[PDB]
Design a protein around this ligand. Structure first.
Ligand SMILES: [Mg+2]
Ligand SMILES: [Mg+2]
Ligand SMILES: [Mg+2]
Ligand SMILES: [Mg+2]
Ligand SMILES: [Mg+2]
Ligand SMILES: [Mg+2]
Ligand SMILES: [Mg+2]
Ligand SMILES: [Mg+2]
Ligand SMILES: [Mg+2]
Ligand SMILES: [Mg+2]
Ligand SMILES: [Mg+2]
Ligand SMILES: [Mg+2]
Ligand SMILES: [Mg+2]
Ligand SMILES: [Mg+2]
Ligand SMILES: [Mg+2]
Ligand SMILES: [Mg+2]
Ligand SMILES: [Mg+2]
Ligand SMILES: [Mg+2]
Ligand SMILES: [Mg+2]
Ligand SMILES: [Mg+2]
Ligand SMILES: [Mg+2]
Ligand SMILES: [Mg+2]
Ligand SMILES: [Mg+2]
Ligand SMILES: [Mg+2]
Ligand SMILES: [Mg+2]
Ligand SMILES: [Mg+2]
Ligand SMILES: [Mg+2]
Ligand SMILES: [Mg+2]
Ligand SMILES: [Mg+2]
Ligand SMILES: [Zn+2]
Lengths: 150, 234, 208, 138
RNA sequence: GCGGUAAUACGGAGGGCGCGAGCGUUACCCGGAUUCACUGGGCGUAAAGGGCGUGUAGGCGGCCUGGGGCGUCCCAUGUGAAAG
RNA sequence: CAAACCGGAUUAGAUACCCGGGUAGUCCACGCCCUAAACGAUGCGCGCUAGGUCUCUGGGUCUCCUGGGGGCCGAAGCUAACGC
């Protein structure tokens, strides 16, 4: 079925009179490794709970990735807020040459040869969100044909 | 079914609190007030009713939302007149998107509809029979016609897409087709199947919503005489 | 051979049997059977999520300890396969697998690579009938790897090709059990190699 | 006075599409015209036309979008997602036939003026010419 | 960033990791640094709009036609030693 | 009217805040100085991209249209956010 990776876990803090109160965030990707991935942000009281909850959220908002032989149809850059991911396609053998955050995402979609650059801020939450918006934006020769056609 | 080249009340409403996206459906600004293109009301009316028809033919349910007081009754009757859920009082946030939870508020209503029968509703404290007969009448208040839904609706019939504009959002996010009685102060784009008309003066909200169910139960085999409020609208 | 030292502690650390010694690694006596945890004091304590980095390291070591190559020797092989034309993961294996020391192992002249590295530095091995005493010599295809005429009967190589009577040798090698000849037919293909290692991971490690 | 009129048109377009207009007037010039011809051929615009907004000549450009979508925000997909000036005044940009851009692995064009006329990236490659890289569209 | 009497951060020990006739240190150069940004950044509050004008040189320059062909593009050709 | 200054108070102290005086200065002419939270902390120019509304000032068929200017709310959009 779906594999899950979990790109990051964090421990946030809120202020209470006498003492500060905690919680945990969990970024997780899920993918089938043949063209579907989803990114989940799961915040909650206990770690394994928010990991689990993140998984669930990630199964909404999937992206269908157009893998053309383990890679990308074209190249995009996406700026998500102050982060910027740059995806560039590659020929077989190249492997996923990418950060840790976008490797997790890309790998679970099935991309097996890609070039990648993180630019702007490096906040993994945003970089992930951007990697995803990148995959979301990939068109293929076929979709582009449908668009222009009259 | 149409009421063709006819304008008994259909047309223009709203002054200059419009939305310029709605400008394709405007004929003129007849003395401080836009007038809805009589044609295009009928033009949309055709396509949309065909959807409403075809969907009820397949058996699915339509959620009627109408919170504004001008239609706060026309909604309840015409929706009881078919096997459809209505939302009449106020639109609870989450009724759509948090259905699995706003549902199990009905599993307390139906559980308390019958709970007025048991031999121990006179036994077990009288101070706790008070919040369990007033609560019941609050669930009967809001979840009046929401109880009919046992699962998400297939389409949703909104009177003022701008007043009950949360319900338009909620459908949208769950991918439920938005039908609406849209009028000048509303975004045409957020409506999948629009009826460009009016959502006040009661006359127009009856003529449209009545005809709505006329095509519904026509497709539910039945085909009945007017059973509504043609005079009960004054 | 090279490295030199307790070997089964490596079998143990990589959590996989690596077979760094021929016989015995088929007995119920390789430590991995009935002692399969890492070596040392904290062998049996539970583990922690090894980092991304950690994973790539071990996966490399696993490969690299399988062949008994050094690392400057190994890195050079991978670097060459990198520059080289073709797919760099699979090609790397082919270069490893083309080393005389290992080709001798494969043809079952030696029971393991460590022993095969000896048989070579000690000139018991011929390539195209001329003594090659270099364990890292690269055997191209067509070449014929023999046992040296005047070696052709030590207590060891006799008993070692005795077992090779009726055993099968890789698709990419033909062997002659009689004259103790044997041939390198083609650079082994990735699929041929049943290596307990994801060679891909290894590529990630070297591009850190 | 518009400093760059090719860019004002590329933009006028971009601004129109982004709010899903029907069409839009750009003031007339053979060159601008010469370009839109290409946009049409490759399907980025339905068409252009030589209308005449009050006395002086314009080019009504008619826009083409996607179909309506389902979800929150139905607004259709642009056919022209991206359209940018490459060579601008005070930084002209000429490429030889050997270094004409491959735009989006070819799911998009680049428009260049050459001595053989205004051509696409694939058009100039056949004809074997370079020129002044005017804009990419994809 | 560790050490303020239970230190996986100091010193020793056992154990482990990495390389191995080498292993470390220091020094220096490019990299990561889109951190001088042509590719490839910025200036309301993070550093950054000149106190405002007038205007010199300079940069930039609407629509149509024709000449030249300086930029630009194309073909052929000469040159681009050896080593690397 | 008021830096400095001279007194009176207040205070632990009071070179201060409060009180009574008080010169330069604040004023005018002419000549310097050239600074600033010289602020919209937002260079100038031109084109394009929903609308509502309040206001100053023109014009036309003056319930309304059409300019120039000053505010507010807001479409798309932008922004680290605030916000624009
Ligand atoms: Mg930015
Ligand atoms: Mg930074
Ligand atoms: Mg209304
Ligand atoms: Mg101690
Ligand atoms: Mg302590
Ligand atoms: Mg210690
Ligand atoms: Mg340390
Ligand atoms: Mg640099
Ligand atoms: Mg910067
Ligand atoms: Mg500043
Ligand atoms: Mg200024
Ligand atoms: Mg200043
Ligand atoms: Mg000048
Ligand atoms: Mg010019
Ligand atoms: Mg000039
Ligand atoms: Mg000429
Ligand atoms: Mg010339
Ligand atoms: Mg040379
Ligand atoms: Mg005084
Ligand atoms: Mg005084
Ligand atoms: Mg003066
Ligand atoms: Mg000055
Ligand atoms: Mg402007
Ligand atoms: Mg007047
Ligand atoms: Mg104004
Ligand atoms: Mg003013
Ligand atoms: Mg917005
Ligand atoms: Mg900006
Ligand atoms: Mg915002
Ligand atoms: Zn072993």
């Amino acid at each position: 079925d779906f594999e899950e990776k979990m790109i990051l876990i964090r421990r946030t803090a809120r202020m209470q009179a006498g003492g500060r109160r905690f919680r945990f965030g969990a970024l997780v990707v899920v993918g089938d490794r043949q063209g579907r991935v989803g990114l989940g942000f799961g915040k909650a009281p206990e770690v394994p709970l928010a990991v689990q909850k993140a998984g669930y959220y990630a199964r909404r908002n999937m992206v269908e990735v157009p893998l053309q032989n383990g890679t990308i149809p074209h190249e995009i850059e996406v700026e998500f807020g102050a982060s910027k991911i740059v995806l560039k396609p590659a020929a077989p053998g190249t492997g996923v040459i990418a950060g840790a955050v976008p490797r997790a995402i890309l790998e679970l979609a099935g991309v097996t040869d890609i070039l990648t650059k993180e630019l702007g801020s490096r906040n993994p939450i945003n970089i992930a969100y951007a990697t995803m918006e990148a995959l979301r934006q990939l068109r293929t020769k076929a979709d582009v044909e449908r668009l222009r056609k009259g | 079914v149409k009421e063709l080249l006819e304008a008994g009340v259909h047309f223009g409403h709203e002054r200059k609190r419009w939305n310029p996206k709605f400008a394709r459906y405007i004929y003129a600004e007849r003395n401080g007030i836009h007038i809805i293109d009589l044609q295009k009301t009928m033009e949309e009316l055709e396509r949309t009713f065909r959807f409403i028809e075809d969907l009820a033919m397949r058996g699915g349910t339509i959620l009627f939302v109408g919170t504004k007081k001008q239609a706060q009754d026309i909604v309840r009757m015409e929706a009881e007149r078919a096997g459809m859920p209505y939302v009449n009082q106020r639109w609870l946030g989450g009724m759509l998107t948090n259905f699995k939870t706003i549902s199990q508020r009905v599993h307390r209503l139906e559980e308390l509809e019958a709970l007025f029968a048991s031999p121990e509703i006179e036994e077990r404290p009288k101070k706790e029979q008070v919040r369990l007969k007033h609560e019941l009448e609050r669930l009967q208040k809001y979840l009046s016609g929401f109880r009919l839904l046992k699962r998400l609706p297939d389409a949703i019939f909104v009177v003022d897409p701008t007043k009950e504009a949360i319900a338009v959002r909620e459908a949208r996010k769950l991918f439920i087709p938005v039908i609406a009685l849209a009028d000048t102060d509303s975004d045409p784009d957020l409506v999948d199947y629009i009826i460009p008309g009016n959502d006040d003066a009661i006359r127009s909200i009856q003529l449209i919503l009545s005809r709505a169910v006329d095509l519904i139960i026509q497709a539910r085999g039945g085909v009945v005489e007017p059973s509504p409020s043609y005079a009960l609208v004054q | 051979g090279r490295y030199i030292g307790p070997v089964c502690r490596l079998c143990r650390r990589e959590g996989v049997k690596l077979y760094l010694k021929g016989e015995r690694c088929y007995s119920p006596k390789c430590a991995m059977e009935r002692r399969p945890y890492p070596p040392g004091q904290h062998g049996q304590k539970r583990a922690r999520r090894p980092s991304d980095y950690a994973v790539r390291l071990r996966e490399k070591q696993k490969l690299r300890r399988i062949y008994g190559i050094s690392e400057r020797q190994f890195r050079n092989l991978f670097e060459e396969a990198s520059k080289k034309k073709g797919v760099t993961g699979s090609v790397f294996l082919g270069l490893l697998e083309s080393r005389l020391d290992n080709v001798v192992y494969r043809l079952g002249f030696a029971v393991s690579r460590r022993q095969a590295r000896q048989l070579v530095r000690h000139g018991h091995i011929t390539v195209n009938g001329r003594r090659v005493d270099l364990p890292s010599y690269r055997v191209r295809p067509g070449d014929e790897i023999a046992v040296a005429e005047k070696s052709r009967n030590l207590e060891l190589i006799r008993q070692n090709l005795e077992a090779m009577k009726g055993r099968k040798v890789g698709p990419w090698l033909s062997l002659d059990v009689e004259g103790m000849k044997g041939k390198f037919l083609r650079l082994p293909d990735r699929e041929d190699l049943a290596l307990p290692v994801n060679e891909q991971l290894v590529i990630e490690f070297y591009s850190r | 006075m518009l400093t760059d009129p090719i860019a004002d048109m590329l933009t006028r377009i971009r601004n129109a599409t982004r709010v899903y207009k029907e069409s839009t007037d750009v003031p007339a010039s053979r060159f601008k015209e010469e370009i839109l011809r290409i946009l049409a051929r490759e399907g980025f615009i339905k068409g252009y036309e030589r209308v005449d907004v009050d006395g002086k000549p314009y080019l009504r450009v008619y826009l083409k979008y996607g179909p309506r979508r389902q979800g929150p925000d139905p607004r259709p997909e642009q056919v022209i997602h991206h359209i940018r000036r490459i060579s601008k005044p005070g930084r002209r940009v000429y490429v030889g036939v050997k270094e004409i851009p491959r735009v989006r692995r070819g799911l998009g064009i680049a428009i260049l003026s050459t001595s053989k006329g205004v051509l696409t990236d694939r058009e100039a490659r056949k004809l074997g010419v370079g020129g002044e890289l005017i804009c990419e569209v994809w």
